[PDB]
Structure formats: structure tokens, C-alpha cells
Amino acid sequence: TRPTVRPRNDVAHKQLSAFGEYVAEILPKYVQQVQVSCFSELEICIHPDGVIPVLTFLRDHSNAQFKSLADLTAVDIPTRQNRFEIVYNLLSLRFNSRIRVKTYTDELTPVESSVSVYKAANWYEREIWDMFGVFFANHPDLRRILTDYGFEGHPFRKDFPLSGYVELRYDDEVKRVVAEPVELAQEFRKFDLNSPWEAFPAYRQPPE
Amino acid sequence: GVRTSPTGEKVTHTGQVYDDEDYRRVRFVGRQKEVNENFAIDLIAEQPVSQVGSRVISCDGGGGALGHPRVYINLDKETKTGTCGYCGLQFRQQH
Amino acid sequence: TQLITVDEKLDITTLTGVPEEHIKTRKARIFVPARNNMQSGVNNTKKWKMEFDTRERWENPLMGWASTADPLSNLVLTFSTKEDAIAFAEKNGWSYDVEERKVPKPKSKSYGANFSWNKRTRVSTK
Amino acid sequence: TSVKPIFSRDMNEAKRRVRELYRAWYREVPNTVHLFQLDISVKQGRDKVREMFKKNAHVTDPRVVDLLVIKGKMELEETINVWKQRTHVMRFFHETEAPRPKDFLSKFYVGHDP
Amino acid sequence: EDNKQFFGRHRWVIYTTEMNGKNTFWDVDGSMVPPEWHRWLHCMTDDP
Amino acid sequence: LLKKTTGLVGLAVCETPHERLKILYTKILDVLGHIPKNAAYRKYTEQITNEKLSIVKAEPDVKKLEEQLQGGQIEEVILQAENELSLARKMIQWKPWEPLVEEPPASQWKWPI
Amino acid sequence: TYKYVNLREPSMDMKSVTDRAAQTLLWTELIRGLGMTLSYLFREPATINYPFEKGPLSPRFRGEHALRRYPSGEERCIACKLCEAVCPAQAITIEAEPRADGSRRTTRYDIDMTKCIYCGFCQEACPVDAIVEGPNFEFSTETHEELLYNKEKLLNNGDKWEAEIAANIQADYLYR
Amino acid sequence: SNLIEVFVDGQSVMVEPGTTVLQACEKVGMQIPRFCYHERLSVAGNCRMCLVEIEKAPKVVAACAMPVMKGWNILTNSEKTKKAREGVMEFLLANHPLDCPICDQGGECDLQDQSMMFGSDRSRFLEGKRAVEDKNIGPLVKTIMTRCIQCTRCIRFASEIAGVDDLGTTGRGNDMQVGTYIEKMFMSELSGNIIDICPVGALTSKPYAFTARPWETRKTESIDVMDAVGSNIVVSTRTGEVMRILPRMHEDINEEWISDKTR
Amino acid sequence: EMVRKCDPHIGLLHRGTEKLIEYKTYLQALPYFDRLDYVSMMCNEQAYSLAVEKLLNIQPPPRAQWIRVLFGEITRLLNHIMAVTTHALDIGAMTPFFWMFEEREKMFEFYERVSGARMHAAYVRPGGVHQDLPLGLMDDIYEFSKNFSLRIDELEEMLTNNRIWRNRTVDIGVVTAEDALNYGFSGVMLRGSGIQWDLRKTQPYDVYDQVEFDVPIGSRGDCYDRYLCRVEEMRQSIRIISQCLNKMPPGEIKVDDAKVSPPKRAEMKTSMESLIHHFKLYTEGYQVPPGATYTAIEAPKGEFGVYLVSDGSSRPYRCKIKAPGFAHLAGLDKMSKGHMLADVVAIIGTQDIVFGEVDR
Amino acid sequence: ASATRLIQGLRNWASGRDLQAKLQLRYQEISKRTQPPPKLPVGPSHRLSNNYYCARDGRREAMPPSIVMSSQSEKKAVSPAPPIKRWELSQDEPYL
């Protein structure tokens, strides 16, 4: 398995497992799961009441010093009753490491804003408001950032269609760009691509 | 091998031509209906049937890797030729 | 306290931005998709799907393309269980119907039954 | 059934917030008609505000109306601070959209939509 | 050709003054080049 | 030797780094004594803070102290001491050594779905 | 493994101070910048004489689309719809049927050239080298629907540019 | 009960006596690759794709035909099971024609899909392939016999469900041809269902032929109205136009077949 | 004259790119990354390719990795020419714009010789690169690199010691190191502040642990040290290009797993397995094992990252794109306080901001 | 390249650099536009024996993430990695 297979990094796996145990036992009030991927990425899956205490820990603790917020992300997964999965990618420049801090919310429960921990989040979770509808409590200026000004709907929710519900055109009667319900001259062609055969037996879920 | 409808419109190699009462001929008014006058069905009929001395022939379309994937054609039917499903060339066992 | 008690039905239809025409006139279909009978694999029959009733597709006058006006014509959603799909459709105000999962019943197989002494299940060739 | 609130502990605080948002929109409509130099009246714009408030008037969840007040405050901030153009204000008035068939018989005449 | 000119100036076309019925004495056009000279002029090959 | 600049913009050079680190480490330990003993934050932070304080008390030099504290410049070691102090003062209020406040739903971290 | 841009202390002896003051009062670096601009003034410019001189292209160039043929006139496209499956912008629209000699051929091969991202995934998905993205880049139109190519237009682009397309494929097929 | 305990990859499962290895692996949610096994046809055991390692046994068994013994540990993912699958897929693809672009089975091919999932990624066959004379078995089923992998689902369907006994294998060895041996027209009331169960594009639908391709079709689940059976079907459409009609599995109606009028 | 508050309204180029990625396969979603940082095309290709190859648990061949690093540094020259010359053009120095876009035209010719497109190449793919280098390309890359230092020298003649350029950059947009780390800055925005951080050095990817180069580090956190950092990164990119041209290994350019990278067209037309794999990789695509990665590269604007979530299918379930310019333009409001309106265009220039990656 | 030596001397004086040694316009030093055909090599998996795909299957060695902690003594405090080594100043050109 030398030439075409990715080489496995066992040292980083052991070190991130040790630090995941470390964070899970320093903060048992909020840490729900700790996992390390096969390509050596640590994920701390927490309760959403511990957004500020965990992120303040990793930013300020002398064994963590995750001073940089690389990226802040939501994921819509509609089969969960807490469908939105808020993802904090963090970078420690002191220990040259990356961690992932994951939590959850539904449409109505607010997540506490992490602008007091990382100012970088000021736009990111603002975008999570615009793209997913996750409200962030105590954000300084929470509003839309990417959509049009009269835009109804949170587009990166997976029940939002690819083309939207409206489309613009100029109308010369009213001398104005107007919004109408979207009619495509060619419909987007949905391709059902998934093979009916199991691809990865290591990921087989136990049946009902 | 293009022919013409009684409306004066060239029938394409698919067989498409608008009806007389079809309004969509108005897009060609003052302009032209671009057809290709090299019908592939009329050009592949012009090729000679290759007489080979084998029972199974292989075709790749010529050019090696510049043709189609290499298929194998059985020639056991003496009633009918064996036609390549890609390039349309056809083969006959010479016995 | 910092927790309130909302005994109401969960309804987010005023927050999704979906227009009323595509909430109250749509029928969501909740189903496990059938196995494609061109194939014996069953990995496409493991999840619940939500789709909608197909609306009008017409011919583009210029190119003959399939023009549509239905925004929800490609919206296929994936759910681990039936109750997650039902809860997602009820939360969004979609009128839904559910088809239950059709499993293949366990067959009785025997290679020796191809060569019975006195039963009709002999194979005439193999 | 114990959920974390957004702003309102019950529906009465929620109705207070709905009411203050309606007051702010009602005050804003003449300034919006003036500085966007619209072709509508102030009364017609206040009718559109009342229509958009009555559109959501069936909600019984405090968190949903808290998000509705939050989104109304956001639209109000986009209107006061001139971030919307004239077109975003006039999108509430679906004017170039032809009126849809409402009864059964005209929807039967035009096509297949129920 | 002029291979003493730098790369880009070293191959050029003086267009015809009449092509396919159209006067091109002043109305020269980049699409007037036939495909066999279009490899050479755009330097897809060394060979005319 | 009086280092001219730290190289980091806005991180001013400390005239007496040893005394400032002793003050900050004993202040971290004084704040950290108000945490319960079985809490892992207290045990781990006492361990690393006593290690850093013994390294500071064992080395009179500034350069060698930087190369064996292994946290970069001495002024960002001071900055990390201030950050750990602020953190421990917040960890008293948060009380995160408590049990888990709520289990997730049953398939909340199940991937793929 | 790192270096310090701009960490120089200027010398404070009278020589260097008077050098910096002659720079300040006599504008020496401004004359240096005028010298460099004057130096490009007397260079031959890099300007080619378009449309008579053309920008240099490679044989891999991805321009206008063309449906190709065999060396018998038979069209190479056997309607397999791999190009429209791989097409990242869904620009390719294909309908097919068996024609009068029973051959698997298309009745619709449309490419919306205003959806097309010109990435050439269609010509590398194509198993028979039917669709290619040829060398024409000068095909600007005056109307939007003139950039909505059907099968007739694409087969005519193949018949138009085939003498060039075949030679470009002849140059680059051993890299593919 | 009389349920015996067996193991699939170490996982215990309680199965009825007579249950095959493949069905025991199905009960833990694992689908063994197959070409000739069909759960509504008789067990043939002649493609050898389902060969799986039983541990402490130095020979793979055909999982579609072998009954489980008590205490077997079926190793569905072990090294020699995967080597067996790759060897069998190599022999299936040795003489198989390079027809995937011009074949109607492409995209919905069992041979393609479980070659992608269980076979190798490349060829060693340096020889010339065989080519088979095509057959005319009627106006419904187009027949391209070079694509045939000789799994004999033809013959078992026509014998056991259609009740015809007019398909078979003539010849012997690599020249073994599935066919009727004569110019015979296979027109049963259920004659198009062999288009379903043929895992390759050797038997395709002649009216569906060349017109569409499976990934671009929309699958609407619907009901037959051609008689009062109420056969569950999939109307596959493509851009607002009905392409074809497949069956749905309903165990109590139409088990997974439809009639030729329906199809 | 002063600026009290700067509120950048964006979304004017929000295209919904990463929702369009969710309905496309992995190979199909690769050309969206050419169009995010649309002056740094093959670098974003590389970040997406490394994300997918990390989730696929495969690795590119060595020659593909050296081609990726070579074209990554050519791409870095492209982006810093764009950065420096438009940053000088908006201030008023319009002439080195035209002086350096001829060199930028020649590097677009390098892209077009290797891929067929001048900008959006779709060349760096998960599994390697799409196609091997044509013959004579490395000679011309050497002929470019042999002369490009003189171009940097005359750019640096026109701007660096110029007192008008130093008045518009030296005390403008001063960023402290702690505020740069807290605001999510990356790349030159950290390195002008004196932060010693570079992902090619610290968290190295394809063969950047095998090339030798230096990291330019600022001292004052301003526009001028960031200008000097970008000029010196062009110097070091020329250095890495020399090391890549000398240490280019023989071999294949795709991974030799034909279930991930498509086979050659000669064997697609000859072998049965190769035709099946060509078919399925260009219609369904390869299945990626389920999981979420955050793969970051040192793009010429900073940390460019992809948080890619796969569910086991041939299409991405989620693809979040971290751009450097998003956090940079968020920190614009802090960087512009206490300055003038004509300083704002210089601070928008010193943050290398391309709104394709900012808005997605 | 066709500049007269008077203009060439004025140009080199004004720039301060020998510009003819490094010209930005390209001439006969570049590669031919017509090249010989390549013979590209094959990778390591182009073998006729000992080349089973299961022994080089990268996608099927990827595992689900190992759950280190789940909610269903004097041990050393750890960090996510060792502390980063201080970068060394360049011997090539430190500007110092």
C-alpha cells in the first residue's frame, strides 16, 4: 500500500487522541463526544450551552492556545431534530495544530455568539444567519451579508431549491428591476447518480 | 442528402421540419435554417463492405487510439453483414 | 429558569420564506425508493426520501428544452427514519402522504430442490 | 417541551415587541415614500405594512414571533439606512406580476395547478 | 514570417480585399483566416 | 541585554520578565486555589504553572528562559500567563467541572445519516 | 528559513545623513523612477497587431465546440450522453433514437454556449472523440440565441474546422 | 425454536436451517455480490461471484447455494474473499465487449457497478475477445449476445416463471451460447421481464433502445391500469416525457414482474 | 477627512457557489474553485484536490505533486502581480501595472499550454493533475524565471524607495499581531505584523517540505511592510520555481488508481475494466468515504480552506469555503479607523481582496 | 533586440541595468511550436502479477473516526502537538 495510498500519520493520531481526552476531562460539563478521524483531525462535539466556555478555553489555555478561528460553518442535516450543525475550525499556531468544535441547534434555539472569543466570527456567524437562519444571541450587528436586500428564505438550508423562488428582470413599464416567480426555460436536470451497491463496508450501518 | 418540404424548408438529417401552420418558421424569416448537407446515414452507406477471411473481426474505427473502443464482430451469419456499433462500418466473411 | 414552556405545535412556515402557493397546494411524498429492477443492488433502498408532486413541464419554443415553473421539482430530501421525514414535513406545513417500507420477504432457497425425486421443482436444464 | 427563549418568555412580551415594530414601521412609511420617491401613497404603504403584519397573525409560538420581529427589524434597518434601492421597497407591491386565477374555473382554464 | 521580430510579431496575415462576396478592403476580420492557416498563424505549429 | 523589539507588532518589550512571570504565575495559582481539587482544570493548570514557575526560578537568563519555556518570546509568555489568569477567573464562574448538562439526541453525532 | 523585510537601522554618521538629505532635497529616487519610465520609453513595445497578428495558442486550447466525424463521413457521436452527464454547467442536451439503419445516433445535441464553462470535460468524457472543443475563439454574436448551438450547428463547426481539429488532436492525443 | 447461530464477520445472527450464506449475510445488512443468484429464481451457482471465505476452511463457498452450518464465521470482507471477487470479475470482463457507451445497460449495469465495487481497476487480458451471433427472439427484447455473461437467468425465468422451456444453452465451454438454437420468437405474456433480470445489456428493451439513459430519468412510482392486478410500476420519465415502465416490488401482487402490455 | 466607521456591504458577487457544489459531483465541482479566487486558480484547485484526496485516503504521484507546486508558485506570481500592481494602480501608480501584465500574460500562456485555458484550467484534480506537461514547457518556464527578477527589480525601483509610495503606505493600516490573530487574518496580513507563520512551512503539503525558501516577515504591521512581503514572496516564488524545474521527477501524473483518476484514452479504448471505470468516473463519479475535512493551503492571499463533508456518495454533501479575504474585509473596519478616505483605498489594496472568494 | 546601440546604451543607462541580457520580449530562445511526440510512462500499478486491487485499495482503508470519548491519577497534561520550533533566520539573505 505504498505508492497510491495516503500514508497514515499515527503520531498525530495519538497526540490528538491524548489532547481530546484532555479537553473531555477538563470540560465534562459540555463535551459530548470526542473523535479523531483516520486522517488525524480532532473533533470536539459539545453541547450548545458551552460555546463560550469551550472556545474561551481553547483560545486561552496554555496547553491549547488556539488563537486563530480558521472557519465557522453550519451544516443543514434535515433528518436531525437539531438540523443545524455549527462547526468551529480552530488553529493553534503555538502547537501547530487544528481542532474542530461542533455543536447543534434547530430553527428556533439561538446559539450564543462567539464574537467575545473570536472577532473573526463577526461575519461568519452573520453569514450563518443569512444562509441558514441560525440566530446568534448578543451579536453586535446581526443582519444579512450575502443575499439581496428583500430576500426571503435561508438558501443553504437543504429544503431551499437550487434556483430560488423569485428571479429578477428589468421591466420598462415601471422603469425598474422587478422580482417575479422563477420560470426556467430549461429545468435543472436532476441526476440520480448513486450506485445501488455498497461502496465502503467499513461504514456499514447496523440495520433495523 | 437533404430534401425539401412543400413549405420550401430543408428537412434535417433527423427528419425535423416545421409544419406549414407552425408559427415557429417565423424565426427563419429574413434569415436561414442552418442544416448540415453531409448526412452520415447517406455517407456510411457509401462505404464498401470489407471482405475478410476470419470469423470474428475487430474494429477500432481506424487510427488506433484516435477511433472508438475496439469491438469484436461475429460474422457467422452469411445472410447479413456484421456492422460495427460505433462507426457503422460493416464486414463480411469472404467464404 | 432560562427555559420557557411552549406547548404549541412546531411550525416554521412563516420563517422559511416559501411562498404560500408552494406550502398549501403541495403534496409531499414520503417513501423508501423502490429498487431499480434493472439491478440487484439494494443500497438505494436504505433511506427515506421526501419528494413532491410533479408539476407542469412544457416545451421551450426556441430550443425544445423542458421549461418548468415549479421550484420544488428537484427537491429530494433524505431521512434516516420515517418519523424524521414526518416531523420535517409537519414542521414546514406540507401536506404529506407516507408509503410504508416494502421489504422483500424471506425466501426459502435450496440448491438440492432443483433435483427432487418427485416434486415439480426439478430444473429441466441447468 | 422546555425550550430556550430568544427574547420573549411568553406571548405578551412577544406582542409588545410586535407592537413596537409596527409603531416603527408606521412612523417610517412617510419617510420611505419620500426619500425613495415612490409612486404610492403613504396610506397605501401603511396598508402594505398592515397586510404584512396580518399575514403572520396566526402564530402562537413566542420564538417564531421573536424571529419575525427580528427579521422585521432587519428589514426596517435596511429601509431607514438607505441600503435597499427603490426596487426592494417596491417588491412588496407585486405590480408587474399578473393576478393569478383564484377560483376553480379559471385555474381549470389556464392549466393544471390546484 | 519574420523570425527577427519577437514572438507574436513574427507571423502575420495581410487579409484579402474581397472574401465570399464581401468587400474586406477596410473590413478585415479575424475569422477570415481558414482553418489550415489558423494553426500556423496562432502558432499551434511550426509548419504552414 | 535589553532586547530592542519583540518582532510582534504591539507586543511591548518587558524590562523585568522574571518578576512579571513570578507575579503572574503565583497569581494564577492563587486564583486556581479557589477551584475544587478534583477538577481537571485545576490539576492540569497547577501542574503546568508549577513547571513554568520552577523553570523561571531556575534560570536567571532571559534568552535561555525563552529557549526552555519554549513559548516563543518572553513577552508572549507573559501574554499567555495573562490569558491563563483571565481564563481561570472565568472558569471559576462557569464551573465546567460539573457533569454534562444534557445528553444529545440519539442520532445527533451519527455520520453518515 | 525566514527573513526580515524592513528591519534596517539607517546609519547616523554625517555621510549617511547628508546622503539622505540630498535624497530629500534633490529628489534622487524620483529621478530614478523617471529614469526607469524613460527606459521603457525607448523599448520596443509588446503590442501585437491584432487582427493581423495573433496571440500564440497551444493545441490544447479550448474554444468553440464541434461534433466530429470518422474518415468516412459517419458522425462519431453514438449518443451515449457521457458528455452531458459530466457537464458541470449542464450545457449539453441530448436526445437519441435508433435511426433508419438501426444505428445509435442523436436527434438532439444542443450546447448552450452561454451556460458552457469551456472546461472541456465533455471532450475528455467522450469515448469516441465526437465532441471536441476546437480552436475557434472568435465567434462573438450579436444575439443571445445565436449562442444556442444545436446539432446542425455543431456538425457544421466540425465540418468547418476539422482540418485543424484533427491536427490538434494529432499533436495532443499522446498526452491524453 | 430451531434457529441456528452463525456469524457474519464475527456478528452473531440466528437463522433458520436451510438458510444460505448469502441470506445470513443479508440478515446483518450486507449484500454479497452476485450475477446468477436471483431470489425469485432457482439457485444456479454458475457465475461464482458470491464466493466468500468461511473461516477455518481453506476453500471459498458459493454463498448463494451453500447452506450455513452452525458456528460458521462468514468473512464477507477478508482478503481471499476479495481476491475471489477480483478473479471472477476479471474472467467476466475478459471476453466482455467494450460496448458501455453504445449499450443501454450503462449506468444501471450490475456488471459495471460491482466491477467498480469489487473487481480490479485494470485489465490483463492481452488476447482477442470472442464475438457471438445475435439472436432474434422477438420484437420486444433486443438481443446482443456478445454482452452475455451466461448467468442463465434467461433460462430459469423462462422455465420456472414464464413456463416456456424454449431458452437454453447450446454448445460447450467458451462457445456456450444462450439462445433458442432455432429462429424462434420468445413471445410470452411475461416475456419482457428477462430485460429486468439480465444483469448485463445482452437483453435490452427494443422500444426503449437508445432513447434514454438511467441517471437522467425521473422515477415516478405508480400503478398499472392495463388489467385489474394493480401492478406497482415505476414510470421513468425524462424532461416531461415518459421513457419507460419498470416494475416495483410488491410481495403480495406482482412480485417484481409486470406483463408485456404493462411494459 | 477622518474615517469613523467603514461598513463594507458585500454579496454583489454572491453566486451561491457552494450550494451548486451540493448538486454536482467532485470532478464537476472542481471548476467552481477556479472562479473563487479568480487570480489564484490552480491554488484553489489544489486546496480542493487535497481535501478530496484526504477524504479518499489516496495520494498523488510525485511528479503530479511537483507540477502542483510549480504551478502553485507560478500562480503565486500571478496573484502578487495582480495584488501589487492594482494596489499601486488604485493609488495612482499606473505604469508597473502595464509593465507586469505582460509577464502575467506569459504565465497565462503557461496555463494555456498545460491545460488549454488561460485562467480556469481545471488542471489540478483530486488524484494528481489532468494531463502531463507538453514538451518544451519547462524550457520556457526557465526562460521566464531567468528574466523575471529584473521585472521585480524595476517594479521595486518604481515603488519601494519612492517617497510618494512611502507616504501612502508607511503609517497606513497598522495591525497588531494579537488583533490579527483574533480577527482571523492569514498570510501576509499576519506576516506584516511579525507573526512567523506560513502553511507551506508549518503544515506542509505536496512537496513543500522538499523545496527551500524563506518567509518574508514585516516589522510594523502596515501597508508598506505587506507590500515588501509580497515583493519578497515573488522573489521566493522564483526560487521555488527554480527548485521545481531542477527537481522534477519522471513518472505518471494521475494516481494509478483507476477507480479515482480516469484511465488513459488508449487503454479506455482497449481494456474492459478501463472503459467501465472511464464510464463510471465520468457519469457517476467516484464515491468518497464519509467524513468531514478542513484542508487548508497557503494560497497567495492567505489560508484558503475547504471544509468538505461527504456522506458516502459521489457528490459533496457540504463544501464550506474559507477565503482569506472574508476575514480580511471584516477587519477592514478596524484597519481603517484613524485614517482618511484616500487611505481606505490603500487599505482595501493591502488586503488582497478578490470578491469572488469573499462572496462565493 | 533590434534596437540601435545608441538607444540601447541610453536605455541601459536610464534603467541602470544591462537590459539586453534579460529581455522581456521573446525570440528564438523559446521552444518549438511543433514538438516530437511523447512516450509517457505508466504508474506503478501497471503490472501483470502481484497487482490485486485489494492490496492497494486506498478508499477501503479509510475508517470511521475513532470515538475517543463519548457520552453514550497524576497523569501528564498534554498539548495537541509538541510546541512549534522557533524559525531560524535565513543564511541566504536575512536583510541583517
Ligand code: SF4
Ligand atoms: S466545455 Fe464543460 S461546460 Fe462546456 S459543454 Fe463541455 S463539459 Fe459542458
Ligand code: SF4
Ligand atoms: S458527444 Fe461523445 S460523450 Fe457525448 S453523447 Fe456523443 S459519443 Fe457520448
Ligand code: SF4
Ligand atoms: S452490459 Fe454493462 S459492462 Fe457490458 S457493455 Fe453494457 S453497460 Fe458495459
Ligand code: SF4
Ligand atoms: S442473456 Fe443475460 S440473463 Fe441471459 S444468460 Fe446471458 S447474462 Fe444471463
Ligand code: FES
Ligand atoms: S451468485 Fe452464487 S455463483 Fe452466481
Ligand SMILES: [K+]
Ligand atoms: K438487461
Ligand SMILES: [Zn+2]
Ligand atoms: Zn468501428
